[PDB]
Every structure is written in C-alpha cells, then in structure tokens.
Amino acid sequence: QCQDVVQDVPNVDVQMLELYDRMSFKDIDGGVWKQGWNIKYDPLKYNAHHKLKVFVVPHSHNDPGWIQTFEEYYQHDTKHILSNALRHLHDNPEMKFIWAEISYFARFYHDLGENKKLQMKSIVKNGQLEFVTGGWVMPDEANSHWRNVLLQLTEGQTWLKQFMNVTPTASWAIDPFGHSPTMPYILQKSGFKNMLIQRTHYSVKKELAQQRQLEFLWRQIWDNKGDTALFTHMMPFYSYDIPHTCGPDPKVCCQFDFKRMGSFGLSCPWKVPPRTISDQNVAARSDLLVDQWKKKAELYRTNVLLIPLGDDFRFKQNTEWDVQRVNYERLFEHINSQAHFNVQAQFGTLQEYFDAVHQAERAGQAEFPTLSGDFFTYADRSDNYWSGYYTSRPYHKRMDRVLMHYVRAAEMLSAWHSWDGMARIEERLEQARRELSLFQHHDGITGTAKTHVVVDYEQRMQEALKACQMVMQQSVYRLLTKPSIYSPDFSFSYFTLDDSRWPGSGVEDSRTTIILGEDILPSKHVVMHNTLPHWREQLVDFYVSSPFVSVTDLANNPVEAQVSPVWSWHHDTLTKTIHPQGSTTKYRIIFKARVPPMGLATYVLTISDSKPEHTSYASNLLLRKNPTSLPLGQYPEDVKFGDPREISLRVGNGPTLAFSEQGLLKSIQLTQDSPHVPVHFKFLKYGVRSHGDRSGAYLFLPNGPASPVELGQPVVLVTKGKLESSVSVGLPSVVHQTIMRGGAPEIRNLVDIGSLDNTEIVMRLETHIDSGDIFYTDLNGLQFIKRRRLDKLPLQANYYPIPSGMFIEDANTRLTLLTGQPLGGSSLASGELEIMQDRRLASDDERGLGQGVLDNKPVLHIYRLVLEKVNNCVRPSKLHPAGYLTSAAHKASQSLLDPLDKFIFAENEWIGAQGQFGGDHPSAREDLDVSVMRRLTKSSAKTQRVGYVLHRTNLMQCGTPEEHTQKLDVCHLLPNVARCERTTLTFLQNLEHLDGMVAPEVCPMETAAYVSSHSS
C-alpha cells in the first residue's frame, strides 16, 4: 500500500545533489548571454508544416510591501494598474494579462462598484485576465513553514472561488530567492498541473539549458513511483524583466520594452533605445526579434515558446498599455504574414502556454526528464550567494512561528462549536489568517524590506496575535463551563494567555503575575490546551506573588511543583558587567501538566502561609569574581556564591551535562555508565569585506572564516531543582541559557547585537562525530534533505536555510539541533554545526532595498539539542538524498513549534468550571498530526462542514518496541456526521466520497485533507 520512503532510492534523470557533485561552477564570459554561450539554430528547423508558436504573456510584478507598505503601494500604483487593466482588456478583446497576488486583487475588487465588478468577472470568464497561483502572496520558499505556505494559498484561492468562480492550476514564482520542492508537493495536492520558477543559480541554468532539461517532472526526493510529480518550467536567463525574457541578448530585448523611449523616465542600460514600430522599420525589427525567439526556443523541447512581457508594477498608465500593445500588434501582423519566419505569435496567458506544450507532448513531439532536489543556495552572479536573508530581521522570523501556532490553536479551539455572528469569531480569524499570510511574501519573512515596512508587518502581526487570543479565550470559557451556567459577553476577557517564550524574558515585560494573598484571593484557576492529537505532558510555569504556592488538579489531587526565582539580566553601565538580578516579590512556579489529545486540562494554584508539602525550592549559585549579595524576599533558600568553575548537572534519569567555567556546554553523558561525549558550544563573529562587494540584507559575503567572540570572565548563574535546572551566562551580545527537564536540553539565546556594525554573530557546536562533508537541513519544516559541503564553492554557498532543524551523523552517533525560528546555517568542517543568530550591516547590497540592516532589536531564539546513538537505526542507503528524524528529535521539534497554551482565569471566581475537555479524543500514533482543524461554515448553514489537514511524517526505526495507539478518524470527531469527503488541501474540490463516513489515516510523508458534514 504505502510507498517505502527509506529503502528505495528513486531513479531520476536529474538529482540535484548528484548534479552539484559533478558541476564545476566556472563563471566564464559567455558573450551577450553573459552566463551562457552563443546560441546557434538551424533556420530550416521550422517550416510550413512545423511552425514556432509564440505566446507573449503580459504581467505586472506587485510586491505586497518592500520599499513601500502594502497600503502605500496600493494607493500609489496597484489600484491604477488594476483599474487600467480592466478598461484596456475590456476595450481590446485580443489583449491578455496574468495576475498573481490575491491580497491586492481582493483589496481592489471590494472597492469597485457593481457595474465594474460585473465587467471584471466577464474578462476573467472569457480568459483575457488569468490568475496564476492565486495565493494571497508569492511567498518566500526558504524561511516559510509549509503550514503557512498552505495557509496563504488557501486564503487566496478561497477568495477566488467565491468571487471569481475560478481555481488556478498553473503557478508563477518569478521572484523568490531560490526554490523549494515543498511548493510542487503542496501544489500537486491542491489540483495543480503546472508550475514556473525563475531564481536558480546561474550555473544550474547553463547546465540544464545545454541538455534541454529546463522543463522537467519535479518529484519529491523520496518518491520512487513518481505520484508526487509536477510539470515545471524553469526560465533560462538572469531576470524576469523584458531585457532578460525575449532571448539571450539583453541589448536587443531591451529595444522591445516600449516603456523605455524616455517619456516614462526609463532607458536601456545597453545604450540602444526602443524605436516605435512603423511600416519602414517593421521588417528589420521583426528580423531581430524572431532571431532572439528562435535562439530561446533552442533551449526547450517543443515548438511552443513562452515570452513573458512585464516588470515591477508595470501596466500602470493608459499610455503604457497603448505603447506596449500597439507596437506588439504591428510586429505580430508582420511576422505572422511572412511565411519565411514560420512563426505564429500572439498575446497569451500562462495556462494557454502549458496547454499547448502538453498538446505537443501527447502528439509525441517531446518527452520530459524527471528531477528531484531543491534550488538553494541561489547566486545571481559571481560569488553573490543569497544566504544572508536566511537570518535577516530574526525578531520577525521568530514572530512568524509564534503566530503560526496561535492561528492553528485559535482555529482549532473555536471549531468545536458554531458561533453566533455577534461573537465576531469568523471576523477575528479572517484578520489573523490574512496578516500571517501577508508576511509570507518574499520581502516579509525574508527580512528584505525597508525599516518602516518591517514595522507595518510587525504591527499587523501584533493585531493578529490579539485576535487569536480573543478567540482562544472565548473558546476555553465555552468548552469548560457547565452549559446551563455559561453566560458569555463576547467582548470580555475571561482568560489571559501566558507565554514564557514570546516576546520573552529580557525582550518585553508582558507576562501577568498571579496575585494571591490571605487578604485578597486565596487561589487561581489556570487552563492548558494541547493542539496535538496525542496525550501530552509538559512542564509549564507561571509568575506568582508568593513562593508558598501549591498545585492541585480539578479532583483536588496534589501535583508536585517547583518554585524558582524570577531572574533578569542587566547590562550594568556602571560596573561594565552583564549580571542577573532577582525579584523579591515575584516567583516562578513550575509543574507538569497532562493534557488530552486536542484537549484542555484545568489546575488550581493556592497560597499557604508556609512551605507546602508538595512544592520544592531550587538552589541558586552565582559564579563570578567580586560578587555582591542577591536577596530574594520570602524565597526560602539563600543564593550561594563562588569563583568561576566547571560544573555538572543531571535532572531526573536524563542526561548529565558538563559546562566550562564560562557557562558553555562541553559534554553530554547519556546514561550512568556511558562516555562523556564532547559537545562544545562556541560563539563567533563574521565581518564584512573592506573592498569589493559588501554583505547586506540579501547577500552573505564574509571576510574569511569566523573569529571567536572574546568572552572575558563572564557571570554564570546555576539554578538546580528537582523538576528543572539551568545554566545561564551573560556573554557579549548574548545571554545564553541551557535548560534541563530530564530529556534533551532546551537552549535559549537572548540576542542583542547592540551597535556592533558590520558583524554577524554565529552559534557553533563542535563535536568529534565523523560526519566528513555531509549534513542535513530541513525544507519548510516538512522534510530533511542531504547536503554536501563543497570546498569548490565559497563559504557563503555552503550556508542553507534552517527553517526548523539540522543534523550531523556518523555510523554510531547523531547530533540534531531543532529551532523555534528560521535562521541560516551550515557544517563547515567534519563534526560541526553552526547557526547564525543576528546580523547588523551598514551597507546596501545592490538588490534594490537601498539601505543596510541597522534596525536590530533584542530577540529570544529557542532550540532543543538532541544527542543520540544511531547504530541500531534503519537509515537510507548512502545514495538516498533524504534523511529522517528519530522519535525524540521529532517530539523536541513539536515542543518548540506547538507547545501547550496557558490561560489564567481573569476574575476572582469561575462559576461552573470543569476539569477537562477532550478525554475521549483518540490518541493517535506519534508520527501523525492534525495540522489544521477549521470550521468552514457560518452558523446559518443547515449542513455544517469542518475541514482537517492530516500530515504523517516518517520517523526512523531504531528498536523501540511499538505500543498500540488508537486509530484517528477525523470525520467522527464531531457528532452527527452525515458525509465524509477527501478534498484538495485548500478544501475547494471534493475528490472522494468516503465509505462509512470514515477518513483513513495517511501514509508516511503524505498529507491529505478531509471535510466532514454534520446535520445541525
């Protein structure tokens, strides 16, 4: 039944890791096609019975924020482009236009009068205006999580189905900085038949062009059969602009961009301008243009040629529509009537191109190669590798992952019920989905926008977080109150969220202290939510106003707890040291919460006059020369002091960790008898070149290998508790923390690069694992791909996106680092892993941004560090291009991305409170997730519909015996099911009507969507 994703190496024509190993990457001058060669063709190839069919496809690339905000661009440019497109297409029936960004289209359409809405629907229905992809945005492919790529695709396509009655099946991605196979994975499971990409390494374009492998069936790296394959067209030249889309010579192609004659303020850098087409020049002009087209056609296998015609924010003025259309019409009339050219040229759309290509294929005219792999790291020229944007603006990269989880939790918690319109649930969820979707743009999460635009994205995401909080807390109140008591005010705050890691300690003072006291309030209810479909235990912490607090469940059973101080780190501008201060009135209480699958659990915190029976207190040790006292109020244990020294810690029966006198990990011992395995954390800095090209928001151009950060004699704080222990150290630019709860440690870095201009701070792990030149990184949080370090390429080319994790291994040992935020990283030597923390750059790097990166702010980065023995694991063979996590590493990743949510009851007494929700929910096998649960209907619908996206990962078999778990059938999670359907991942098309209304579980590495219908 299910394909084996481990043991069968797929046979493909092009495998990108193998291609990389073989290629020389020489940057030679190819002539007018600077990165290619002088293309030759046989004029006799095309004749009366075999013509070249040319589709000229007008387009306008509209960024939802970059140099201006979304709203600024909409007012100044996009509203005019769309208004003039409507008029010109209406009036010129043979003219065509494609549109990608639905965020702008929806903004425009809703402001149109009814007459114009009808005119717009007519030019879509008749095929003159065609939507390509139909996502909210054209997303980044490096830093984006697959869940958010799907979210933004669904937001745009749901809008298009409702208002335009169309669902695109061809994708257009002309600007993201490199390309991921996560895109065809999602698109192929969402009804698509074709896709187009542009930004791939210039050496790759040359190699594939020589073999006519620029069109290929792109399958996943583990897919032996090919059921994931999606037809893909890679454009051959340096850019998507008119000079780089007609053919190989931009000096010639520029003369066919009729906006560049002078009155529009544009010109041709190659110093030859366009000239208006006339009867006296059309033959010579056609001669030049057809020659360019026939050269481009030599790079592809069919007699159908794609010629994009557009650029950034084009087709804005009426006069521009006229100058492009009339000049091209004169060229077509001449070319199509001159038999000697053997060409038929016309305006077309993207779907028309692909339909004609496949007609040629079915006629036996061409066969296409198969391909697997990715297209990172991109370089557009010379040594200019775009690995900087894997890290740029890391505060907002972390915010993306926080909001990702809040959107999932808000949609899931509120899906369980139908809500009255007055509750504003659908309104708040639509706002949250749209702001997160907007940020997936290739100038949003990438960190490549102007400072004021980054601020706009941040403000939008903050409003989205508040919307999610409102929906979540209303839902908890409804799910856990006796129904005959429940009395909602839909504007009221019944609970506030408590989040320990966002914005984070030392970033914002945002958390509420639970205030208890004999003369005010003896106790407080708290509630935990678990969005994952299995029972889960996790330590949770709250701030409380007394150390004498104990925890009970809602059967009044005692729960073991630990109290620790609240520690904050300060850069002391007087003593010139970085050191911790403790609160004398706020304390942390920590306990293990146990929560049902997709469920809720209630606990109670109660004050007493002295130390409670079931609460313990951490010890605290400050290691520094020249200590001063550290009082802690009522906290029952005095802080201890010492000179810096090596130390060792063990929580529970977990690993024993040893630290240097500077507070940095040096070894991990997995069990009592086992070796102390060298595992060393180190912080280093990269700089910028003093001559030639400078690093900026896009480009990483280091001045050689990194240099160690000079640490001095830093202050180290050791907290030792029964449930949780930690070592924290104040280093220059980073407060580095290692936290132990009985399994793999959690690492937290509070990163403040301050005023350190032209500096990139990296965190490195040094081990003696014999990894050689191999390492693994993830793509969009979906799959792990094998990387090979290449010493034939510069340092920055060996940097890859780390959207959620990375690992190295040898025959016996693996080290995996999981992340709570996308960052850039590599393995630059055998046994090493490294990941960039932040970067501050004074210079612009010549890609259009027009500023450096000087707007850094403190960010709390989070990680888990998993050392494991892998000698017993069933792994792929040496030639397989994928890798897979273990159970422990996968659970560690879930602990970072989808932790328990914590709610504090906001008033004194919760009347009608219940102890648990979801105790009867199935606890599914650990590799299965309910990635999305979303109610699809409003309360007035007779038949309610709920959509689910189910994802199964693939975990290594390493000899841990399987325990039986329960089958998860999402179609029976809500009562009164009347129908269950398998759908596309966007929920927009029914694919299968399911027997017995049962939704089957999916295979490893597969994702499916189901919709259940319920009689209400």
Ligand SMILES: CC(C)(C)c1ccc(CC[C@@H]2CC[C@@H](O)[C@@H]3[C@H](O)[C@H](O)CN23)cc1
């Ligand atoms: C030399 C100049 C004119 C600055 C230039 C440099 C690069 C490009 C390529 C297009 C760039 C690539 C980075 C990217 O951030 C931007 C925006 O998303 C916009 O849509 C154009 N894109 C176009 C033009």
Ligand SMILES: [Zn+2]
């Ligand atoms: Zn762009």
